[PDB]
């Protein structure tokens, strides 16, 4: 790129090769036009060994940077130290001033003892890396070794004429550098250039002599030079050219790659002090640079002008301001050392950085006054204490090598052990705050070779000679192998079940094909750089992407050939988005690029507000024909955790413990009903107990990092058995007073974690044996069942469910268009299926379903608010009977209530939530609590309690404790009846198919279905959970997901994805049109 402050062309370091090692020796080269030194790659290039230079004189000490910047120090006496506050560099010369020699301490303790007494040695500490410069007989200080604080040395070997002939990295590999005469010698240039680097050996001493012309050598990189000695080509490990350069008087005027990238430059004068006046990118933007006294205006081929402002002269010049294309002005402030101390965004919000001592930083203050203190040891310069915005402190205790032996956080202390002599900075034993101990093993490359978890299960890894992972073994002994080409790209991935993936790449290293052993593959086409141009899947569908000169996506074409348009402003912000169905959304932003308004297709505008930290503060949803304008207010803690989410119908308050675990979540409805969920956590932040409202508390029995092995609810105890991979293989339930278990559920797993067999045996005699069959793709192509008819599944090449054939029944064939829209019996442009399953569907301007008419004449009207949430529906049956339902939501778009009006009688159901999981159904005379398996949406057990409406004084007490964020005491609970416990018996997808009571008998049984998840039943209210995260609405027949409503008879949602194109090309598709394989728990 071009640095507008200086006008110079900078090529950041490009890693030609980096073979894995305890301290990887990355052969990185960079170019700076203002650098006048003629290195081994020409003028302006820096290489390993010749990156940093050191000059010591009787009056001054100069440390030349990689970019050629001359950092000046006073005279460096033997044993003296110098610190560069502006550069964060430490220099110490070996030897002593004359007094008694003492071993170096603090930051200088990591150097070898012999180097400390050598007057002709100088140690440079740049961050965490030590550089050893030794004065040679000719009087030039050149790098000899680059070791870290752990002692991993990278020896540099020099010869006569000062050529870096060999490098030996920390893994024992020997590199050989070959030099040839590329141009005639001149002033300051002998003509020798680096013609390539040879991997001389992987272990042992390097060969004494290497013939460059001898075939069979391993050239890690090769370089070509012109007649003037300028670098014109870079070749990879193979013979392929990967970089091309063009020069005018040793000034970079054109650089790029064969295909892909090509940038040309123009200079006012062809000299190191010259400045770029035009940057022409092929297929991109042409930028013109105009240099003023204290500013640089960068014009653009699109007409945009950006102004970069700077102050100071010489090495103290700093980038002070930035005026963008629309006039937005950002400002930066610097201290006396040139370090950044303040940063004001275009809105004026200021971020401070208070610095003290030689650590260069001790505190950063957010615009919302969120301080992140960071204390560093004065002597060793290593992190000691870390404090976040909530005053939670992490304390680090370190050994002599600076390894953090114990990390003391707000929740216990984590202890580390370093018992490997070869690798003294790799932890070989980690003890978590809970007390579990993990053991690690490392190989000669410093990479992980074996991982033993808290339970004693060992994961093993294997690597080749270049430190690339080629084999992984799980505790069960399943191998995952990898294959690489000479360039180091992954070209093969053999999984544990025999399924092998193969990858292909183009000349630029971009992935172009992913294929399986079956043969069908996904193809990638690329445009300029990493800009994707076309994706073709196995089914033949294509997603075409169109970009403009600025690299912004301006058109997206789906599989049906329908385009989605995008428009941008001068700041490359999306200001208009037209979907595949013509739904147009307009966006507005403030000076800080924050979305403050979003006009939708119906002309209604949603306005957003933010706090000082940039987090969302309030959403002003516009009024619609069936809902008033509503304001949803959000409050955040200093660390970014949500503290409250207020709305017109509910007020959700989150309370966190001293560690940050969500301790209490209280939901206070507008009518006074309060539902609170209380959790307790261990030292690892894993829930140990859970109280769902007034339901009996659920005690979770976990081992290790939260692996569940038991559960206690009332008089019922659950027991889980797990294999070496911590996958559940057995499940029992026992009730106090009963000798035999209520049920036993045993499972067998496929190598890739796929369920292979499952057997459920209730105490009442119900035996459910289920066998699963999979194809090479991992798709479930068959289920053998002894309770339900066996089913065989067929899928197309795109992964969509084509047919399902139950035993002794007609097949259910499904047909899709290119985009993935179900076709009854050409295509649905715009992805709005207006006719399927004998029903007519009518959509509004925003894509929401607003009318469904059946063949018999049944009519379903739907009404939405400005947040696209179903707030009112009317259903008319063929028998001339009506039904009205109204829904209420909180600020998080979670349905909190359901009011169904039928025959003039009004019935209200309130729902309690535990995050994204609905865990309560408060009916008029019954509280039904659903407990999901931890960390998922799979229902585990159900609690039913007879209840009565709370007295007015109790409701006030609940609201009082909710305001203070404390759980209601157990002594003030209402007169609820004894809880009845029922157990969910789900299938492979977590869809409940059976429900067993406390005696092992069956309460509810459901016949599996493709898209409805269960065959239609007379009373869907007995068991309303379908799929994962879906609630079956009895009054309407829709399945309520977390954010949208699902149409079981159409296999799609009733409204477009709130994420828009982020969710996928089709805004209505559910579970990738494969309901037997995937699920949408949050409805996104």
């Amino acid at each position: 790129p071009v640095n507008p402050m200086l006008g110079s062309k900078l090529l950041p370091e490009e890693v030609d090769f980096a073979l894995a090692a305890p301290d990887t020796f990355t052969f990185a080269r960079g170019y700076l036009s203002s650098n006048p030194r003629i290195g081994r790659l020409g003028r302006g290039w820096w290489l390993p060994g010749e990156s940093m230079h050191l000059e010591l004189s009787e009056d001054a000490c100069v440390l030349v940077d990689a970019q050629g910047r001359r950092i000046g120090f006073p005279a460096l006496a033997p044993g003296a130290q110098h610190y560069s506050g502006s550069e964060e560099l430490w220099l110490r010369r070996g030897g002593s001033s004359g007094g008694e020699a003492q071993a170096w301490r603090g930051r200088w303790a990591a150097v070898p003892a012999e180097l400390q007494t050598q007057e002709g040695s100088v140690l440079v500490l740049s961050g965490h890396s030590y550089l050893h410069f030794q004065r040679c007989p000719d009087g030039i200080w050149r790098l000899q070794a680059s070791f870290g604080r752990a002692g991993y040395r990278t020896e540099f070997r020099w010869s006569g004429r000062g050529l870096l002939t060999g490098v030996r990295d920390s893994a024992g590999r020997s590199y050989a550098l070959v030099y040839q005469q590329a141009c005639e010698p001149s002033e300051g240039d002998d003509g020798l250039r680096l013609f390539g680097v040879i991997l001389a050996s992987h272990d042992g001493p390097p060969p004494d002599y290497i013939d460059p012309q001898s075939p069979g050598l391993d050239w890690l990189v090769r370089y070509q030079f012109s007649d003037s000695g300028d670098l014109i080509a870079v070749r990879d490990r193979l013979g392929q050219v990967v970089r091309v350069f063009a020069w005018r008087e040793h000034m970079l005027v054109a650089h790029g790659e064969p295909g892909g990238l090509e940038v040309r430059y123009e200079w006012d004068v062809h000299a190191p002090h010259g400045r770029v006046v035009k940057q022409i990118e092929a297929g991109g933007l042409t930028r013109t640079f105009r240099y003023l006294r204290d500013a640089t205006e960068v014009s653009d081929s699109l007409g945009r002008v950006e102004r970069y402002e700077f102050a100071g002269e010489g090495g103290q010049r700093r980038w002070t301001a930035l005026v963008r294309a629309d006039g937005s002005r950002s400002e930066f402030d610097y201290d006396l050392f040139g370090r950044l101390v303040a940063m004001r965004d275009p809105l004026g919000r200021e971020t401070r950085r208070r610095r003290d001592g030689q650590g260069r930083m001790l505190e950063e203050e957010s615009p919302g006054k969120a301080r992140y203190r960071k204390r560093v040891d004065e002597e060793t310069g290593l992190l000691v204490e870390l404090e976040d915005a909530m005053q939670r402190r992490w304390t680090f205790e370190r050994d002599e090598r600076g390894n953090a032996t114990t990390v003391r956080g707000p929740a216990g202390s984590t202890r580390y052990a370093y018992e490997d002599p070869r690798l003294p900075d790799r932890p070989t034993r980690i003890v978590d705050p809970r007390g579990g101990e993990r053991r690690l093993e490392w190989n000669r490359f410093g990479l992980l070779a074996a991982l033993t978890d808290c339970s004693g299960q060992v994961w093993r890894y294997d690597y080749d000679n270049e430190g690339r992972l080629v084999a992984s073994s799980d505790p069960l002994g399943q191998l995952t192998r990898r294959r690489y080409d000479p360039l180091g790209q992954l070209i093969g991935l053999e999984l544990a079940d025999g399924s092998a993936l193969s990858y292909e790449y183009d000349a630029l290293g971009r992935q172009t094909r992913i294929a399986d052993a079956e043969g069908h593959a996904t193809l990638f086409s690329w445009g300029h750089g990493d800009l994707l141009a076309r994706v073709s899947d196995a089914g033949g569908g294509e997603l075409s992407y169109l970009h403009d000169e600025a690299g912004r996506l301006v058109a997206l074409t789906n599989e049906n050939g329908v385009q989605a348009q995008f428009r941008y402003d001068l700041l490359d912000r999306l200001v208009e988005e037209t979907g595949f169905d013509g739904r147009r959304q307009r966006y507005r932003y403030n000076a800080a690029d924050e979305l403050i308004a979003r006009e939708d297709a119906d002309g209604r505008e949603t306005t957003y507000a933010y706090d000082r930290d940039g987090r969302l503060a309030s959403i002003r949803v516009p009024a619609t024909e069936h809902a008033p304008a509503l304001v949803e207010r959000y409050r955040w803690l200093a660390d970014g955790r949500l503290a409250s989410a207020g709305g017109a119908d509910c007020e959700v308050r989150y309370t966190y413990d001293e560690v940050g675990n969500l301790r209490l979540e209280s939901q206070v409805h507008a009518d006074g009903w309060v539902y609170s969920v209380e959790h307790s956590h261990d030292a690892l932040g894993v829930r140990q107990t859970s109280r769902y409202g007034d339901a009996p508390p659920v005690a979770w029995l976990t081992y290790g990092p939260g692996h569940l092995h038991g559960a206690l609810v009332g008089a019922v105890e659950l027991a889980f058995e797990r294999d070496a991979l911590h996958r559940e293989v057995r499940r029992d339930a026992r009730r106090d007073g009963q000798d035999d278990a209520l049920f036993t559920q045993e499972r067998q797993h496929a190598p890739l974690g796929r369920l292979q067999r499952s057997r459920l045996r209730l105490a009442g005699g119900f035996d459910w044996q289920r066998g699963y069959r999979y194809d090479g793709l991992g798709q479930l192509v068959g289920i053998d069942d002894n309770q339900y008819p066996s089913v065989r599944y067929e899928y197309d090449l795109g992964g969509r469910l084509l047919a399902s054939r139950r035993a002794g029944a007609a097949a259910s064939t499904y047909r899709y268009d290119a985009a993935g829209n179900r076709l009854e019996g050409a295509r649905w442009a715009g992805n709005r299926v207006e006719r399927i399953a004998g029903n007519r569907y009518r959509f509004d301007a925003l894509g929401n379903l607003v009318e469904r008419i059946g063949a018999d004449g049944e009519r379903l009207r739907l009404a939405y608010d400005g947040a696209q949430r179903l707030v009112h529906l009317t259903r008319d049956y063929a028998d001339g009977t009506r039904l009205e339902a109204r829904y209420r939501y909180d600020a998080l778009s979670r349905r909190i209530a359901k009011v169904v009006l039928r025959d003039g009688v009004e019935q209200q159901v309130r729902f309690g939530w535990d995050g994204d999981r609905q865990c309560a159904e408060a009916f008029a005379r019954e509280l039904r609590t659903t407990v999901h398996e931890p960390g998922g949406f799979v229902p585990l057990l159900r609690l039913e309690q007879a209840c009565e409406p709370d007295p007015p004084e109790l409701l006030q007490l609940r609201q009082a404790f909710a305001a203070e964020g404390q759980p209601l005491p157990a002594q003030c609970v209402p007169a609820l009846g004894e809880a009845r416990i029922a157990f969910f018996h789900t299938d492979h997808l977590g869809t409940p198919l059976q429900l067993s009571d406390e005696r092992g008998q069956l309460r509810w049984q459901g016949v599996p279905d493709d898209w409805r998840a269960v065959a239609p039943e007379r009373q869907p209210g007995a068991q309303p959970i379908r799929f994962q995260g879906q609630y079956h609405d009895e009054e309407s027949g829709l399945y309520y997901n977390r954010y949208r409503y699902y149409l079981p008879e159409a296999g799609r949602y009733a409204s477009q994805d709130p994420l828009g194109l982020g969710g996928g090309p089709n805004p209505y598709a559910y579970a990738l049109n494969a309901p037997t394989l995937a699920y949408d728990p949050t409805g996104l």
């Binding site: 900078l10 910047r69 001359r70 120090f73 502006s86 930028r287 950006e306 930035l322």
Partner: peptide, 18 residues
């Protein structure tokens, strides 16, 4: 302040284009 002061500012930031 005057100790370890370079004669030229680093070109790492700001950077424009490719």
């Amino acid at each position: 302040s005057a100790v370890g002061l370079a004669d030229r500012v680093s070109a790492c930031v700001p950077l424009v284009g490719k």
